[PDB]
Design an enzyme around this catalytic site. Sequence first.
Site, PDB file in Angstrom:
ATOM      1  N   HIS E  60       0.829  -1.196   0.000  1.00 50.40           N
ATOM      2  CA  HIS E  60       0.000   0.000   0.000  1.00 50.40           C
ATOM      3  C   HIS E  60       0.867   1.251   0.000  1.00 50.40           C
ATOM      4  CE1 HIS E  60      -3.050   2.914   1.050  1.00 50.40           C
ATOM      5  NE2 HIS E  60      -2.449   3.166   2.198  1.00 50.40           N
ATOM      6  N   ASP E  90       7.462  19.957 -28.575  1.00 49.42           N
ATOM      7  CA  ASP E  90       7.421  18.656 -27.923  1.00 49.42           C
ATOM      8  C   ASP E  90       8.549  18.556 -26.904  1.00 49.42           C
ATOM      9  OD1 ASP E  90       5.323  18.174 -29.598  1.00 49.42           O
ATOM     10  OD2 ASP E  90       6.257  16.522 -30.699  1.00 49.42           O
ATOM     11  N   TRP E 125       7.211   0.033   4.086  1.00 54.03           N
ATOM     12  CA  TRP E 125       7.668   0.655   2.851  1.00 54.03           C
ATOM     13  C   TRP E 125       9.066   1.231   2.996  1.00 54.03           C
ATOM     14  CZ3 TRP E 125       9.455   5.014   0.592  1.00 54.03           C
ATOM     15  CH2 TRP E 125       9.375   6.228   1.275  1.00 54.03           C
ATOM     16  N   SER E 152      13.561   5.133 -14.200  1.00 51.90           N
ATOM     17  CA  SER E 152      12.579   5.961 -14.888  1.00 51.90           C
ATOM     18  C   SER E 152      12.534   7.364 -14.302  1.00 51.90           C
ATOM     19  CB  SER E 152      11.202   5.308 -14.817  1.00 51.90           C
ATOM     20  OG  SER E 152      10.803   5.113 -13.473  1.00 51.90           O
ATOM     21  N   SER E 153      12.603   7.474 -12.975  1.00 45.09           N
ATOM     22  CA  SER E 153      12.527   8.784 -12.345  1.00 45.09           C
ATOM     23  C   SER E 153      13.697   9.665 -12.761  1.00 45.09           C
ATOM     24  CB  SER E 153      12.482   8.632 -10.826  1.00 45.09           C
ATOM     25  OG  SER E 153      13.606   7.911 -10.353  1.00 45.09           O
ATOM     26  N   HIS E 228      13.039  12.023   2.761  1.00 45.12           N
ATOM     27  CA  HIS E 228      12.290  13.255   2.962  1.00 45.12           C
ATOM     28  C   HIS E 228      12.244  14.085   1.689  1.00 45.12           C
ATOM     29  CE1 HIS E 228      10.367  16.646   4.895  1.00 45.12           C
ATOM     30  NE2 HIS E 228      11.171  17.393   4.161  1.00 45.12           N
ATOM     31  N   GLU E 230      11.862  12.963  -1.063  1.00 46.65           N
ATOM     32  CA  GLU E 230      10.799  12.326  -1.830  1.00 46.65           C
ATOM     33  C   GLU E 230       9.442  12.943  -1.509  1.00 46.65           C
ATOM     34  OE1 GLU E 230      10.979  10.598  -4.282  1.00 46.65           O
ATOM     35  OE2 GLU E 230       8.944   9.836  -4.554  1.00 46.65           O
ATOM     36  N   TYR E 232       8.869  15.859  -0.476  1.00 49.68           N
ATOM     37  CA  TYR E 232       8.861  17.192  -1.054  1.00 49.68           C
ATOM     38  C   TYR E 232       8.830  17.131  -2.575  1.00 49.68           C
ATOM     39  CZ  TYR E 232       9.637  19.093   3.580  1.00 49.68           C
ATOM     40  OH  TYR E 232       9.463  19.488   4.886  1.00 49.68           O
ATOM     41  N   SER E 243      -1.086  26.898  -8.044  1.00 46.61           N
ATOM     42  CA  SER E 243      -0.810  28.265  -8.466  1.00 46.61           C
ATOM     43  C   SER E 243      -1.487  28.576  -9.794  1.00 46.61           C
ATOM     44  CB  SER E 243       0.697  28.487  -8.568  1.00 46.61           C
ATOM     45  OG  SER E 243       1.282  27.597  -9.500  1.00 46.61           O
ATOM     46  N   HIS E 277      14.811  14.009  11.129  1.00 48.06           N
ATOM     47  CA  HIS E 277      13.678  14.065  12.037  1.00 48.06           C
ATOM     48  C   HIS E 277      12.845  12.794  11.961  1.00 48.06           C
ATOM     49  CE1 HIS E 277      11.347  15.937   8.518  1.00 48.06           C
ATOM     50  NE2 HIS E 277      10.676  14.844   8.832  1.00 48.06           N
ATOM     51  N   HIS E 278      13.202  11.883  11.064  1.00 47.69           N
ATOM     52  CA  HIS E 278      12.678  10.529  11.035  1.00 47.69           C
ATOM     53  C   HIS E 278      13.436   9.584  11.957  1.00 47.69           C
ATOM     54  CE1 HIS E 278       9.853  11.038   7.675  1.00 47.69           C
ATOM     55  NE2 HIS E 278      10.741  11.871   7.165  1.00 47.69           N
ATOM     56  N   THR E 303       7.153  27.670   3.326  1.00 51.93           N
ATOM     57  CA  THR E 303       5.874  27.036   3.045  1.00 51.93           C
ATOM     58  C   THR E 303       4.713  27.935   3.445  1.00 51.93           C
ATOM     59  OG1 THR E 303       6.913  24.878   3.396  1.00 51.93           O
ATOM     60  CG2 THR E 303       4.521  24.971   3.424  1.00 51.93           C
ATOM     61  N   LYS E 306       3.934  30.706   0.723  1.00 51.72           N
ATOM     62  CA  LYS E 306       3.133  30.231  -0.400  1.00 51.72           C
ATOM     63  C   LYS E 306       1.660  30.158  -0.031  1.00 51.72           C
ATOM     64  CE  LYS E 306       5.200  27.742  -3.599  1.00 51.72           C
ATOM     65  NZ  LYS E 306       3.813  28.114  -3.961  1.00 51.72           N
ATOM     66  N   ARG E 428       1.549   2.111  14.935  1.00 49.11           N
ATOM     67  CA  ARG E 428       1.369   1.850  13.517  1.00 49.11           C
ATOM     68  C   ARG E 428       1.718   0.403  13.191  1.00 49.11           C
ATOM     69  NH1 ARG E 428       4.973   6.137  10.331  1.00 49.11           N
ATOM     70  NH2 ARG E 428       4.423   4.587   8.745  1.00 49.11           N
TER      71      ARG E 428
END
Lengths: 65, 100, 60, 47, 459, 131, 186, 100, 230
Positions: E60, E90, E125, E152-153, E228, E230, E232, E243, E277-278, E303, E306, E428
């Site tokens: 999941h 293109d 995960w 791919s990324s 982290h 990721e 973001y 926006s 912080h993890h 943050t 924005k 968890r």
Amino acid sequence: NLEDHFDLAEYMMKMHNPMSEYLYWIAGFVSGLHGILPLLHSNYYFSGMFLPRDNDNTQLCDDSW
Amino acid sequence: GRRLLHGNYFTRYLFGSLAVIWIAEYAAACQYGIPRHRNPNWMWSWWLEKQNQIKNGEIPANTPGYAMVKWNNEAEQRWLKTLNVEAMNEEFARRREAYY
Amino acid sequence: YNLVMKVEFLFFYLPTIIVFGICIPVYTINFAQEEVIYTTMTVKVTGRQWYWVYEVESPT
Amino acid sequence: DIPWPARTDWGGHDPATPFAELMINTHSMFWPVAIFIYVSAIYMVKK
Amino acid sequence: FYILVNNNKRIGIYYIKLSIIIGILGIVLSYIIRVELYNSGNRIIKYDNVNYYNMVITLHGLLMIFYIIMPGLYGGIPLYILPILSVITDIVLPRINNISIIIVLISYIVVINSIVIEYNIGTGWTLYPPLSIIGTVIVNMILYGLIIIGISSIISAINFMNILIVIDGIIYVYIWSIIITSVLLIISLPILNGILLMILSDIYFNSIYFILNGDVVLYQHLFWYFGHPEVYILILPAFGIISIILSVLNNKIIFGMKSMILAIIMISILGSIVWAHHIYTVGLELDTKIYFNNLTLIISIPTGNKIYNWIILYIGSYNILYNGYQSLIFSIMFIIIFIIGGITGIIISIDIIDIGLHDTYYIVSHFHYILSIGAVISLLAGILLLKDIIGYYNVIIKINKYFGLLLFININIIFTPQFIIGFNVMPRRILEYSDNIIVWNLISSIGSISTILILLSIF
Amino acid sequence: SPEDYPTPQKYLEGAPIPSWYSFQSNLVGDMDLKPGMARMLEVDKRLTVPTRTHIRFLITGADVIHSWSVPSLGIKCDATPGRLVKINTFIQREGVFYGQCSELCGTLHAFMPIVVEAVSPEAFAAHAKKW
Amino acid sequence: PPTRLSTPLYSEGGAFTVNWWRNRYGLYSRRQTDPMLAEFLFRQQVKEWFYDVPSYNYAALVGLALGILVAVIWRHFLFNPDVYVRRQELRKMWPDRHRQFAYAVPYLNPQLKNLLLPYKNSFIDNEPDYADYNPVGLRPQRVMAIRRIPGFFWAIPQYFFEDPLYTSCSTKNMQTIYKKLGYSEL
Amino acid sequence: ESADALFVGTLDRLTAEHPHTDDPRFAFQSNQWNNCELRFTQFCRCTRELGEDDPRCKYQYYRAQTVCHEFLLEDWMEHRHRGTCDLDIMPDRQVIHMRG
Amino acid sequence: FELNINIINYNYLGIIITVIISIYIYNNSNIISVYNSNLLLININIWMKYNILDMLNLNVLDYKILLWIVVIIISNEILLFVSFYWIYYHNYINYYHVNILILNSYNIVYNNIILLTLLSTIVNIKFYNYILSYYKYILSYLIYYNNYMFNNKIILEYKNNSNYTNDSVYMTSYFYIILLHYIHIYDSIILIVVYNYVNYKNINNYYININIYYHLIEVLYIVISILLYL
Ligand SMILES: CCCCCCCCCCCCCCCCCC(=O)OC[C@H](COP(=O)([O-])OCC(O)COP(=O)([O-])OC[C@@H](COC(=O)CCCCCCCCCCCCCCCCC)OC(=O)CCCCCCCCCCCCCCCCC)OC(=O)CCCCCCCCCCCCCCCCC
Ligand SMILES: CCCCCCCCCCCCCCCCCC(=O)OC[C@H](COP(=O)([O-])OCC(O)COP(=O)([O-])OC[C@@H](COC(=O)CCCCCCCCCCCCCCCCC)OC(=O)CCCCCCCCCCCCCCCCC)OC(=O)CCCCCCCCCCCCCCCCC
Ligand SMILES: CCCCCCCCCCCCCCCCCC(=O)OC[C@H](COP(=O)([O-])OCC(O)COP(=O)([O-])OC[C@@H](COC(=O)CCCCCCCCCCCCCCCCC)OC(=O)CCCCCCCCCCCCCCCCC)OC(=O)CCCCCCCCCCCCCCCCC
Ligand SMILES: CCCCCCCCCCCCCCCCCC(=O)OC[C@H](COP(=O)([O-])OCC(O)COP(=O)([O-])OC[C@@H](COC(=O)CCCCCCCCCCCCCCCCC)OC(=O)CCCCCCCCCCCCCCCCC)OC(=O)CCCCCCCCCCCCCCCCC
Ligand code: HEA
Ligand code: HEA
Ligand SMILES: CCCCCCCC/C=C\CCCCCCCC(=O)OC[C@H](COP(=O)(O)OCCN)OC(=O)CCCCCCC/C=C/CCCCCCCC
Ligand SMILES: CCCCCCCC/C=C\CCCCCCCC(=O)O[C@H](COC(=O)CCCCCCC/C=C/CCCCCCCC)COP(=O)(O)OCCN
Ligand code: CUA
Ligand SMILES: [O-][O-]
Ligand SMILES: [Cu+2]
Ligand SMILES: [K+]
Ligand SMILES: [Mg+2]
């Protein structure tokens, strides 16, 4: 050509064969089964039952059913 | 012909960074008062005394450390059964005579 | 323009002031966790699959 | 000590050590600030 | 053709289509969890089959992040409009664009095939060792998927960076969001690949990095150094969409464009140096914890700017324009939801508060409000805005106030109780729990079944 | 030299050196639960500690990462292999405090609860001597 | 910000100036193909970014964050006992690492820890000074602060002499209560 | 009989008189793994000089138990008994300085 | 007039390459993997053929696009090595006092540094000739001799080392860091085997790529040499 101007012209012009949509939905349905079928198979493999009865792993009253 | 970086950038930022690291470390040592004398030796006092005895000749040369302890492990007990320091010294003495 | 610049300034520094207000409490509580204490008893805890093992000093 | 039914326990409950109290007080200290941040922003979500 | 197509707009559609298909499996896995957590005692998973539940949560999390949201927000919308927002025709690297979507599909097939064929076990995960390296072959298969997904990324990130060379217009805020996300991938992915190889080495090459005298905490540093950024990387493209939607649907120029752009840049710089912080509960040094806690709070400053700039975009817009369009509602809903998720993130940034809330459902609710609601709604909002350009039909989503209201009410029912459960406390990654947490878990479960029913109404 | 290994004078005079006692705490199974026990939280052997005493908990994990959590005592420390983390606590009131492992650790992550009972120092001293 | 290319832009000397920025801005640019066009695009970028007032706020933030980042990295290498760069101590067993142990105590007593530890009473309600006393001497004896932490601590009085119950909850009073019963030593 | 006697002589003495408190050398860090290794090495060296039966080395083992979990000690004590414990290898038989 | 870009509509190598990747997972024999690797090499060559054929478009930005792609790839290679250095130095506190024999600082480091420096000088001469529109046949064969010695030395070192990957995290990191460098040396062989003189000269992205890549490998070894041998 005019037919080639738009990408996926048949779908955008509303002439596509419905089978394309069915396959897309079927593909999604099959993807979902990958979470349910192995659940049933694994439950039976380790317990002999496809699904548990609720709270069957705990002590139950005599009249519980 | 137009320049993007410092004219001597590679040497500047390599030697310069090393210099700043070295000078910063000396400052840090002074602030905390860390001893800066280098010792290349183990500090086990009892062992250093035994080594001095070997140097003085009190303990025969080439005598193993396990031959001098009050507790021996199994592997050392195996080695003690085949240890002959006297024979080892004679063999070394023979080699010196042959060489000279 | 004059009013708008002040609003943009507030958007940045009002959150900054809030952060500063939290910073001092954060330092204090962190120091409390790591304070050196005069403990008199030790309990050793080992985690194993899947149970806990406890080692304690037996009284003489 | 133990969870109890249908309890919010916002910020924690039933401390037994001075450090446990510190954890609860820290959350309660910041909780009003969090409300201020939310209310002030949300009030202006409009045409 | 269908597979040989290099058109970027076609490939963008494929990314959206594939994410929905994989989304069904992710939704199924999510539905399995809440059904099991309805009450104490086994409901659909045998006690002798608890290993399956660990696999459900592991997949999941993995599928939703790497296979659903990331392709949808970073592969789907960007490949469709980014070359249009730029004045170019293109994508710069057409052939690379084709292989990237094919790579995503093959990795998905490998993952789901592993469910069917391999023994089903789970390690989360995050794949923390030593648990990950003492497992069965399903863990090996999942690693291959991640590494393949990583390819791919990175190539897709290379593709977007090349737009700077060819862009013939102005770099809009949305373009900046994609560019900076690409930068984060370029700097974070190679670190992830390195540590993943070490996991394979221990699993498959008799390496000893994760046994005694080898620090297991070493993995957590390298993983979260990518972990982290990721999160973001997931959200920054969502910011770009919001926006555009707010400015377009209100006929208002984006206020503080440069402030918005600098906020995105600032977030990436800060997001790359706050990963620990993890790792608050592992026992880091006092000074180390203070540093990460202090820098983590600073991320709120950019943050917050924005958020406020978005609010003024909606304020003062003409009343005559109809405001019930689903795209506009979702964009506004994002601001309300994101603030909730971010504020709870600041609460759990305080390490002493985190001691109590680590590995609890409070953390679950934190990232669900941001991702499951915010990111999904942003992706939905963007697709709705581009409905005419994309041209899809046969759905009732453009003007459907029932869907928006029901979705908002029910998702909040799922995850608001999970904040409360966090203090109760419920860990968890747990299948059984004490009887006194049933009420809140039951309410969230009712929320989950309700949300699935709502999805059927769009068709 | 002997002085390189400090030892309190009492032990050098023949005082008996303390020994350590180890026990295992396991979840009580569903079929073994008694009428009043709390499901998923009770254990067969609890950890008894004295109240109003500074205690040092040293927490590690033998095989995989577990986490020792006692929410009432404000403790959540990861039991990582290779790290012997130190946690200090001072219990103010008597009671029984329940907790659960807070790091996914395998099949039965949900079935290794933590139970700590704090008693009066006099009660603890009697308990320690008997066991 | 001038609007005519004829009017020059003032530049200072150094490594970050208008002239320094002009020289490097168009190095990788395909759009600055002639002087007139190059200057127009250069001034367009300078006007948009450097004359934007709110942009300077982010410049301050990146400086502060990076300054802290560099300091913490450097401090660990220089002072942290557990961090090793030289190898002399790593070639010996633990008891022989005398030079490394010199870092331990001073690294254990940073200034900020001494300043802020006395403010624990702004959080703990009962026995905030439970851990203040330690006879070993590795750290100073702690004395509770007399004022609340500035900021968001409106829950407690501004000064602790305003709280009628503060003295009753001190570790000394609780120790008196429990000693009177023989309950415990502390 | 001096107030600072604990610090005088050795830093070791600090936890010899207060076994359950932090050691000055490792107080800065929550992780006490290095503290356990130092304590075990001290026990190994005590036996070599004084022998196992000596009450001093018996207490040194107790000090190690104060910071070392039993599953670690059982494994390490097994290696020590065989003679493969890298901590207890005699200095003259170390290989740390060999081949670099 | 003409369009700024000649669009590429269709491509089928992507499917083949992706399927080739899957074959690695679904193999039941390591022999299939060996032959599968040849297919990957073949298809990657075809993709390189398409890049050369794109020269017919006469697009000025094509050179710039590929050059910046290589820069990104170079950064990824550097960051991959950083992770290995990160892994190595994390356990630094556990090194140098375990009963293992670490490498000598006299023999291996010096000859490798000398050997790899010669490799840089050869590539530098190739760049100079490329600037002067000139060629020297012998240069390529000097690289092959250089690569032959490097392979011969590394093979013997691994075989005669008396410590193994399972002995300590130090040994694992030593072997892994050295292997990672070797793989990048082997990747250089893959690139340099096709070096030829092309008459369109300074619009050929291959020359600048090879010069950058060879320099990266050599500088990385300096970092490795300082970390491990010295
Ligand atoms: C998250 C959910 C909620 C989302 C909500 C929000 C959504 C917002 C909107 C989003 C919109 C995004 C943008 C959309 C753009 C659309 C553009 C478009 O339409 O492009 C045109 C494109 C193609 O149109 P075209 O141009 O006419 O194409 C012509 C063809 O190329 C050529 O025509 P052809 O006829 O020659 O075609 C060839 C055809 C040839 O066709 C045939 O021969 C068909 C024969 C009939 C087969 C039928 C299936 C049989 C199954 C039997 C099962 C038996 C089970 C037995 C069990 C027993 C148990 C005991 O097929 C093939 O040869 C290959 C087929 C391969 C693909 C299908 C694979 C199916 C699954 C396979 C599973 C295998 C599992 C194995 C596992 C084993 C493990 C070991 O359309 C599609 O492909 C359909 C798209 C449909 C969706 C459009 C969007 C609508 C809005 C969304 C609706 C909601 C969807 C929710 C998800 C699904 C839920 C389930
Ligand atoms: C030195 C040693 C030497 C050794 C030598 C040894 C040599 C060994 C050789 C090794 C290499 C072998 C392979 C070579 C490939 C050659 C490629 C080439 O040149 O092709 C030209 C050739 C041109 O064809 P053509 O002869 O001109 O005729 C084409 C047609 O006339 C009309 O043209 P077309 O292109 O439009 O038609 C194609 C297309 C037309 O049909 C359609 O597109 C149907 C309409 C669309 C319906 C909606 C589909 C769902 C929406 C998908 C959205 C994302 C799409 C992404 C893009 C497409 C990705 C495939 O239908 C298909 O091909 C099937 C489409 C499948 C779409 C899949 C979408 C996702 C499915 C999700 C499944 C969820 C359930 C999970 C469980 C099952 C998992 C498998 O390419 C093709 O068109 C055919 C490609 C067929 C090969 C595909 C292989 C896929 C393998 C997947 C991995 C399976 C492994 C695990 C098995 C597990 C089973 C359960
Ligand atoms: C003691 C040591 C001292 C050392 C001294 C060293 C001195 C070095 C001097 C360096 C001078 C640089 C000169 C060139 C300036 C740039 C010009 C340029 O790019 O021309 C466009 C040129 C295209 O030519 P064009 O046709 O003129 O372009 C037209 C525009 O597209 C059409 O756009 P438009 O006309 O609408 O707008 C024009 C402009 C609009 O944009 C601008 O004008 C941006 C202006 C600001 C740039 C930043 C300047 C530095 C600011 C101060 C930072 C200080 C930090 C201090 C920290 C200290 C800590 C100790 O567009 C661009 O600039 C587009 C390119 C932007 C790329 C951004 C990439 C992300 C980097 C992060 C952003 C910067 C954040 C700064 C900090 C923010 C917080 C305060 O771009 C390219 O060729 C694209 C190549 C793409 C390659 C990508 C792959 C590279 C490898 C990536 C590796 C990983 C990177 C990690 C990055 C992490 C970031 C967080
Ligand atoms: C009375 C005779 C006395 C002779 C004394 C010995 C002299 C030997 C010199 C050998 C130098 C080899 C250098 C190798 C590097 C590559 C050179 C190069 O670039 O060549 C380009 C040259 C032409 O290339 P191109 O692309 O056409 O033109 C490029 C330029 O535009 C135009 O290129 P370029 O013309 O500017 O080239 C300049 C030069 C650039 O290189 C140099 O100038 C480097 C000079 C280094 C000197 C090394 C001397 C080593 C002697 C060690 C002896 C130790 C004894 C220990 C005793 C122990 C006692 C216990 O390259 C050469 O001249 C290379 C040598 C050409 C000979 C080719 C025919 C086959 C080999 C014939 C050997 C005959 C030996 C007779 C011995 C008789 C003694 C009485 O390449 C070739 O001719 C084709 C490949 C063959 C060349 C290498 C041949 C190796 C022969 C080794 C002989 C010595 C073996 C000693 C064994 C000792 C065991 C203990
Ligand atoms: C898109 C996904 C996403 C996003 C944007 C974020 C954003 C943030 N996250 Fe989150 N996070 C996750 C996804 C995300 N996170 C996930 C998935 C996990 C769990 C991973 C796992 O364990 O498996 C996690 C876990 C996580 C943890 C706990 C890690 C652990 O111990 O397990 C923490 C702790 O601080 C945290 C913090 C933050 C913060 C401070 C932000 C900030 O960016 C939020 C900033 C936003 C605001 C603050 C609101 C807007 C600002 C204002 C309204 C005004 C200013 C406000 C203040 C000054 C307070 N996150
Ligand atoms: C994008 C990521 C994502 C998304 C959408 C979700 C969605 C949901 N998740 Fe979550 N979840 C995670 C990521 C996500 N999750 C992660 C990373 C974890 C941690 C894993 C771990 O423990 O290791 C987690 C853990 C997690 C747990 C804890 C498992 C445990 O610890 O035992 C639970 C329990 O109920 C849960 C429930 C749900 C529910 C009920 C939904 C949804 O049902 C909420 C409502 C959503 C819908 C009804 C579907 C809406 C449609 C889409 C989301 C697809 C849209 C697609 C396109 C627009 C293309 N999730
Ligand atoms: C990682 C280990 C690699 C070993 C490499 C060996 C070759 C040495 C030369 C190249 C590396 C540079 C380091 C040289 C150090 C010379 C002086 C020296 O020996 O210093 C040792 C001393 C500590 O050693 P010990 O005494 O054992 O520990 C005491 C308690 N901590 O080391 C240091 O403090 C220096 C090490 C760090 C140097 C690098 C700079 C540190 C700051 C980096 C900041 C990064 C953030 C961004 C900066 C931006 C700047 C513009
Ligand atoms: C030619 C190009 C070369 C480029 C090379 C780039 C190298 C760096 C690449 C990124 C990796 C960074 C190295 C990893 C650092 C990990 C450090 C770590 O985890 O240490 C923490 C402690 O670390 C800290 O204090 C955190 C400092 C944060 C380090 C961040 C370094 C990398 C930052 C990259 C951000 C992106 C670039 C920004 C550039 C400037 C932006 C304006 C652990 O501490 P404890 O476990 O408690 O142990 C202490 C003693 N026992
Ligand atoms: Cu142990 Cu979970
Ligand atoms: O991750 O936040
Ligand atoms: Cu994070
Ligand atoms: K259940
Ligand atoms: Mg955890």
